[PDB]
Amino acid sequence: HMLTYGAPFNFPRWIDEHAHLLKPPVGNRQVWQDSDFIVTVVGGPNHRTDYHDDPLEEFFYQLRGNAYLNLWVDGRRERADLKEGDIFLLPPHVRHSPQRPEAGSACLVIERQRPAGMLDGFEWYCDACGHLVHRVEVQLKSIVTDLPPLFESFYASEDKRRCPHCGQVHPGR
Amino acid sequence: HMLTYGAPFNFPRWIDEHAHLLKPPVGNRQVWQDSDFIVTVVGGPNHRTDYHDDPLEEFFYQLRGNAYLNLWVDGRRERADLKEGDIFLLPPHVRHSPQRPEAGSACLVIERQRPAGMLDGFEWYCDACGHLVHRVEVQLKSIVTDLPPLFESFYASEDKRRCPHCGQVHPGR
Ligand SMILES: Nc1c(O)cccc1C(=O)O
Ligand SMILES: Nc1c(O)cccc1C(=O)O
Ligand SMILES: [Fe+2]
Ligand SMILES: [Fe+2]
Ligand SMILES: [Fe+2]
Ligand SMILES: [Fe+2]
């Protein structure tokens, strides 16, 4: 039938035109609305203390500049570098915290709409004892707008940030 | 848990190392195996007379060189140009025939594994009366290997290529 999502267009030029809109905490912009593939560009600098626990995979292609992913691989606080030109496929549920410090950076991130009842988690870990401080689960509907309200609630509440092993109150900063 | 799909790596350099393997009819190479996102690069020159009827969306990013998509939009034999640097999201079921004439071209194509019972179609249309000549449906398991055997069967059989409106026998060439 129709091309619902429009005609091909130049991506470098699209990124240039929307550069001034790539803004924190999360830094992104969705290219097409109501699609099954969720196609965003993420710039910087961003502010993220959360780990994301995505029930599906996440494709990355660091188009401009560099960034890294803080991970928890196999229990250990780990890092994956998104050097300019790198690509990478995250397995479902690997906890990850995108750090994007470079102004003018641009990373293509691709995900899919989540079916009903498949939940996304956002977690924070204690920077002293390294144990789970807080975890919210959300039925995700916008990878752009549903994020910061969630982090504000954590940021605004030392009961959420108080650790349950040590009593260290996470800075959320 | 583990990074099942490995660590980030440089995509331009990966494409360079596998250039000599991007070979017709279809021209592709999957970057990761057993993933839900099916991430391929497609080079050229390719030989495609089929239209693909994908039950899911297809993301394109023409990385090197140019290509086009022959389409059937709203009944009309149409074209979408994949100019170097273009991106594009195909809606599910839009019939499309990727033409990739340029040696050394490279296009990122992203799709997802198809659930059980969601079928892919490959169709051919009559180049005289413009009506459907032949359509096979397949449970797709490899976007790389399941293709040409299907086209050989059409190519090898004038009963499949004989049109049911006119009697024009499609060249399959
Ligand atoms: N992985 C991300 C996500 O799931 C949402 C928003 C941004 C990112 C990112 O990688 O920057
Ligand atoms: N759309 C394609 C597909 O579905 C399989 C293989 C190649 C392509 C292509 O766009 O070249
Ligand atoms: Fe994420
Ligand atoms: Fe702690
Ligand atoms: Fe296709
Ligand atoms: Fe015909």
UniProtKB/Swiss-Prot annotation, chains A, B:
Fe cation 2 binds at residues 126, 129, 163, 166. One of its GO terms (molecular function) is ferrous iron binding. Changing residue 100 to A: Increases KM for 3-hydroxyanthranilate 40-fold. Decreases activity 5000-fold. Inhibited by 4-chloro-3-hydroxyanthranilate. Mechanism of inactivation involves the oxidation of the catalytic active site Fe(2+) to the catalytically inactive Fe(3+) oxidation state, superoxide production, and formation of two disulfide bonds between Cys-126 and Cys-129, and Cys-163 and Cys-166. Enzyme can be reactivated under reducing conditions. It catalyses: 3-hydroxyanthranilate + O2 = (2Z,4Z)-2-amino-3-carboxymuconate 6-semialdehyde. O2 binds at residue 48. InterPro entries: 3hydroanth_dOase, RmlC-like_jellyroll, RmlC_Cupin_sf. Substrate binds at residues 58, 100, 111. One of its GO terms (biological process) is anthranilate metabolic process. It comes from the Bacteria. The keyword Iron applies. CDD domains: cupin_HAO. Pathway: Cofactor biosynthesis; NAD(+) biosynthesis; quinolinate from L-kynurenine: step 3/3. Its cofactor is Fe(2+). Transmembrane segments: none annotated. Its EC number is 1.13.11.6. The keyword Repeat does not apply. Keywords: Dioxygenase, Iron, Metal-binding, Oxidoreductase, Plasmid, Pyridine nucleotide biosynthesis. Pfam families: 3-HAO. Fe cation 1 binds at residues 52, 58, 96. Binds 2 Fe(2+) ions per subunit. Belongs to the 3-HAO family. Catalyzes the oxidative ring opening of 3-hydroxyanthranilate to 2-amino-3-carboxymuconate semialdehyde, which spontaneously cyclizes to quinolinate. Homodimer. This is 3-hydroxyanthranilate 3,4-dioxygenase. It comes from Cupriavidus metallidurans (strain ATCC 43123 / DSM 2839 / NBRC 102507 / CH34) (Ralstonia metallidurans). The gene is nbaC.
